[PDB]
């Protein structure tokens with residue numbers, strides 16, 4: 044079992060919603076976990092980002108509304124013997140982050156609206172690290188405005204795979220993603 | 228300091244030829260270090276891949292012809308106290324590889340030719356993992372051929388960054404890079 | 412000489428600010444000249460869009476503030492004997508637009524601000540076609556907003572070219588460009 | 596009806612196989628038709644590239660094996676009153692090009708193997724223009740080798756559209772295409 048992020052999708056329980064391995068390698072690079080650091084993983088999903096954060100030696104709380112997804116998250120905590128360093132929390136951000144200890148880092152997988160970012164600026168200790176991925180055009184202008192307001196690094200990421208087609212190979216149909224890496 | 232690959236380019240002595248931090252994350256994700264595994268790093272440059280591979284628990288031999296770049300590799304060995312774990316060899320592949328112990332993984336950022344690959348193909352223990360980045364049409368073609376012959380994974384990767392443009396921002400002008408990841 | 416848009420950049424007097432030939436093809440495709448239709452070309456530069464629009468049978472008014480660039484527009488008018496069909500106006504939109512007859516189509520390669528668009532929105536006959544290229548994060552955001560408000564088509568476009576790289580070839584480093592095409 | 600290439604897909608009879616409008620704008624830009632010039636459109640499909648070549652004032656022969664596709668091609672000749680400037684030919688290249696008059700330009704939509712390119716170099720008058728689009732990795736290395744051997748322009752083209760997803764917008768999943776524009 045690998046000592047670095049980007050571990051296969053199949054290292055995790057998940058439905059058809061999971062940060063794909065190369066994106067997750069990028070995401071963890073930007074999160075930059077130090078040992079014992081806390082992360083709020085807003086979005087959650089399969090919790091795979093949290094899992095790699097914890098395997099790098101971090102502690103993580105992983106917020107997620109959907110019940111089916113929370114089961115997957117929980118299986119992944121057990122599978123990696125991650126209690127109590129990682130906690131699944133069933134809820135919806137920002138509301139679900141009201142009664143939680145302040146973190147050193149925040150990952151906005153999913154749920155990234157202005158209301159979230161207003162609350163975050165209201166609730167978080169200055170210099171708390173933020174990392175966000177956006178796949179919609181609306182999420183993208185949001186990350187672009189955040190980068191205008193507060194600086195940081197803003198990356199545009201395109202990754203495709205080679206695949207069958209049908210006696211030949213093609214590039215898999217790809218979407219770019221924006222990622223913002225900043226503070227506060 | 229960060230517990231995962233893709234640390235900033237300033238965490239390393241380098242001369243301008245370093246592997247960019249997000250690409251370094253992707254590569255290490257493909258290399259997938261397990262504790263104590265050995266890496267051949269062909270085309271060391273400033274040795275950043277090897278440093279992050281060894282920081283994840285591996286050992287590495289780093290092959291670079293240029294004495295001035297070797298010196299930077301040496302500093303990174305020093306900085307991170309990796310001398311038990313990490314060796315520099317001044318030289319050219321394939322000649323410099325000939326008396327080395329066989330690795331568990333190989334990385335080619337260096338001058339990857341068909342010669343190098345035929346030699347690697349003859350020498351390597353079956354199941355040894357290979358990872359290569361290409362940034363020329365000629366080396367990309369080569370990876371695609373390698374992929375057609377041997378399988379594994381072939382990724383096309385484009386990463387840009389938000390850069391100044393007068394009082395405006397613009398995407399930095401990037402090249403896609405091809406990355407093959409296979410074995411044997 | 413070629414009967415379609417996207418003629419080489421050498422078929423025009425220009426100063427370095429010209430629209431690239433493949434982008435000029437895409438733009439004219441979006442503009443879709445019918446015989447005798449009128450174009451407002453905001454941000455003329457060297458007037459290449461207008462030249463190709465008028466060569467397809469249209470008429471155009473070309474708006475550029477810089478006297479030295481106007482001179483290049485003038486040469487292209489001369490070269491192609493377009494003076495009955497094509498006018499240069501030295502100035503800035505929106506002021507320079509105020510006494511012009513209303514067009515059948517408008518192209519903004521020029522300084523496209525929200526001001527310009529509010530004014531264009533008030534002045535223009537409903538069904539007038541609009542086409543804009545963006546190369547900054549700020550102008551791209553604007554196009555996306557325009558798209559959300561008004562519909563039409565929004566394309567993301569990346570074009571690179573095979574360039575030397577020592578004795579090897581590599582892709583030239585390009586930016587994506589956003590292009591909106593709508594009406595009213 | 597527009598005086599330039601890139602006309603909508605729906606301006607043509609076609610099954611689910613047709614050069615998409617922006618690609619076709621690019622393709623015709625590179626073909627550069629002059630009035631009365633002959634084109635072999637190898638591939639054929641719906642014949643849309645031929646149709647725009649002829650509407651620019653060119654003559655075209657359009658080779659295509661599949662019977663269903665040839666009906667579409669023929670409907671497009673009738674619809675645009677293109678007889679006899681455009682001829683549908685049911686066959687398979689290179690064989691199907693044995694008894695045909697020599698052209699000024701060649702478009703390799705589909706069917707682009709080495710056998711084709713060996714025959715073409717054997718059958719065509721020096722300085723005959725070639726334009727080719729490739730979507731597979733094998734077709735791409737072929738166009739890359741052709742560019743090594745004979746120069747010309749080699750472009751990498753990525754175009755995406757904005758589209759629903761589901762209360763938001765996404766970029767449509769896109770494949771890059773290589774296009775070679777050369778001679779002989």
Ligand SMILES: Nc1ncnc2c1ncn2[C@@H]1O[C@H](CSCC[C@H](N)C(=O)O)[C@@H](O)[C@H]1O
Pocket residue numbers: 060061062085086087088089090091092106107108109112134135136137152153154
């Ligand atoms: N307001 C909100 N707060 C928290 N999570 C939300 C949310 N809105 C949507 N989500 C969740 O965000 C997830 C999408 S992202 C899933 C991928 C995940 N990052 C992974 O690595 O596995 C969905 O599971 C969705 O239920």
Ligand SMILES: Nc1ncnc2c1ncn2[C@@H]1O[C@H](CSCC[C@H](N)C(=O)O)[C@@H](O)[C@H]1O
Pocket residue numbers: 244245246269270271272273274275276290291292293296318319320321336337338
């Ligand atoms: N035949 C060969 N054998 C070993 N190294 C080579 C080589 N040809 C070129 N190289 C080296 O490969 C380097 C380019 S790649 C440098 C990036 C490196 N992976 C890093 O992270 O720092 C150059 O320094 C060059 O000297």
Ligand SMILES: Nc1ncnc2c1ncn2[C@@H]1O[C@H](CSCC[C@H](N)C(=O)O)[C@@H](O)[C@H]1O
Pocket residue numbers: 428429430453454455456457458459460474475476477480502503504505520521522
């Ligand atoms: N407010 C404004 N009104 C009109 N033109 C403007 C403007 N601001 C900038 N421009 C012009 O827009 C040009 C950049 S775009 C040049 C490309 C042009 N379409 C061509 O094919 O040649 C510059 O020359 C600049 O002077």
Ligand SMILES: Nc1ncnc2c1ncn2[C@@H]1O[C@H](CSCC[C@H](N)C(=O)O)[C@@H](O)[C@H]1O
Pocket residue numbers: 612613614637638639640641642643644658659660661664686687688689704705706
């Ligand atoms: N050897 C060959 N010779 C000629 N046509 C071929 C071929 N192999 C495949 N084709 C055809 O090439 C077509 C794919 S391309 C279709 C898009 C077309 N360029 C258009 O603009 O409408 C298919 O119709 C296929 O039947």
